[PDB]
Amino acid sequence: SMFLPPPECPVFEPSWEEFADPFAFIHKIRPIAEQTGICKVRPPPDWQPPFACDVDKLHFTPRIQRLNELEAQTRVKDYTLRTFGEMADAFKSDYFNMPVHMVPTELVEKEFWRLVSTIEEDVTVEYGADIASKEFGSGFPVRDGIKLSPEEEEYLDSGWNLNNMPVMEQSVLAHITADICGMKLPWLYVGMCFSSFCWHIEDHWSYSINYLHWGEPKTWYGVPGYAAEQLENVMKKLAPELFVSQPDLLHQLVTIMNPNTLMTHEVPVYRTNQCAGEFVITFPRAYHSGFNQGFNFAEAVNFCTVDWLPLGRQCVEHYRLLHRYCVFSHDEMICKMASKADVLDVVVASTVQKDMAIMIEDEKALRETVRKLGVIDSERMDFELLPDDERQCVKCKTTCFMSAISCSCKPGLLVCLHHVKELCSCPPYKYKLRYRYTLDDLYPMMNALKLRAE
Numbered sequence: 001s002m003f004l005p006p007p008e009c010p011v012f013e014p015s016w017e018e019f020a021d022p023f024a025f026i027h028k029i030r031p032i033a034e035q036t037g038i039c040k041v042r043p044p045p046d047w048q049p050p051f052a053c054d055v056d057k058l059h060f061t062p063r064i065q066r067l068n069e070l071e072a073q074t075r076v077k078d079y080t081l082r083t084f085g086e087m088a089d090a091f092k093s094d095y096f097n098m099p100v101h102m103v104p105t106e107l108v109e110k111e112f113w114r115l116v117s118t119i120e121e122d123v124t125v126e127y128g129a130d131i132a133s134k135e136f137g138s139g140f141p142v143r144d145g146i147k148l149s150p151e152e153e154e155y156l157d158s159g160w161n162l163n164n165m166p167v168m169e170q171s172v173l174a175h176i177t178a179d180i181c182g183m184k185l186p187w188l189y190v191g192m193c194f195s196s197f198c199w200h201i202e203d204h205w206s207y208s209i210n211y212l213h214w215g216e217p218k219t220w221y222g223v224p225g226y227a228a229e230q231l232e233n234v235m236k237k238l239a240p241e242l243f244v245s246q247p248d249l250l251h252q253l254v255t256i257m258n259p260n261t262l263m264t265h266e267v268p269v270y271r272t273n274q275c276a277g278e279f280v281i282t283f284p285r286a287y288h289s290g291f292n293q294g295f296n297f298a299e300a301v302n303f304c305t306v307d308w309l310p311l312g313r314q315c316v317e318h319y320r321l322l323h324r325y326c327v328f329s330h331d332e333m334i335c336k337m338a339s340k341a342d343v344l345d346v347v348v349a350s351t352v353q354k355d356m357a358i359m360i361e362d363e364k365a366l367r368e369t370v371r372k373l374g375v376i377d378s379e380r381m382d383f384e385l386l387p388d389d390e391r392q393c394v395k396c397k398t399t400c401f402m403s404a405i406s407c408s409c410k411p412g413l414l415v416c417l418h419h420v421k422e423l424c425s426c427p428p429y430k431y432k433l434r435y436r437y438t439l440d441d442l443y444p445m446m447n448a449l450k451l452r453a454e
């Protein structure tokens, strides 16, 4: 009645030995946690990274949020940590006429869903979201020519130090060289009561991992990957405005929506309260949303394992159908790993090899097709040197790398090989096939992976 909390997501407590390697652990829990989309991880009791900061010297620019269900918000767009904390505590305290730890979590949750559904309530809140920088940096220890205490050095190279997470060797998004500040650097989040994150999935259907450093809990709702399209169909009917096409990746539209509405339409939803010192992990294509119980501080990062490689290819294909912008070229990343095959982890090498074989075979067929459309001329082209905005398919907006079609008529414009008929009105013999690699260059790159994998 009014609000029925979804069932709880899985909670794990690895031993020190299980904990030691994050990637092995995540691969272990995967068959369970991927059925629920999110899961929670409780570190061994003595794993306690030192959080230390001065609340007066950390400044950030606040974002403002209106709290209305089904209302469109844009995905991305002055306080000290002390002044924000004072505003946030006074707010919660005045809203309930109680001291902040006496407000039960069950009640804030019930109340959140009441106020977002009521339109005569126009509550607005503020929050912080930014990637680490000089005015505001990681909550985890990092190196800087500042002297560190022995406990800080202990955690400098932890797998679960979220700064290290991308650039480890069982990851695949670290090898990328056309790097993407938005996607491999950690984000910092300063919460207050009711500040919230709308329903969404990660760029390129990656994993994410979130650590609550300190403060009051963060409440999560999560949907398994297999149900992504059920949820999207429910969202199209109750709010189709969120689905009209958008001109940038900085223009994505997202919304707040009651999980009971989704459960009514047969979408499986799970929940959890994440407390200080706990991790939440989201799996590929797993929708999630939530809100903060009070003043808190969190840090999160995207990441990609070898498990994800096939999904990452299917995702880029799905972006093409939707005419959605890519953050990076998936094929470019594969070929970069192939070119460094000798220094690759061997399980990585083996899984990259399988994806490369699919890539090569799809590319063969696409080139045959455009040759039969009458495109004859061709020239090698180093796509990775072009700024991303200079190599998107005019039609579907995919980031080109393996190949593209150009014409002297439209200088600078490209189409991917799926959209040869969308470039211009000249006859095909006026077109050129631009390609990064011949098929003969590609088969030896794949062979290097086979050898490294043995």
Ligand SMILES: O=C(Nc1cccnc1)c1ccc(Cl)cc1Cl
Pocket: 063, 075, 076, 077, 127, 129, 189, 196, 197, 198, 210, 288, 300
């Ligand atoms: O908080 C956010 N995103 C988030 C948080 C936790 C899990 N997934 C996603 C967020 C990110 C960017 C901006 Cl401009 C605003 C918010 Cl409010």
Ligand SMILES: [Mn+2]
Pocket: 200, 201, 202, 208, 288
């Ligand atoms: Mn997220």
Ligand SMILES: [Zn+2]
Pocket: 407, 408, 409, 410, 424, 425, 426, 430
């Ligand atoms: Zn032309």
Ligand SMILES: [Zn+2]
Pocket: 393, 394, 395, 396, 397, 398, 415, 416, 417, 418, 419
């Ligand atoms: Zn295209």
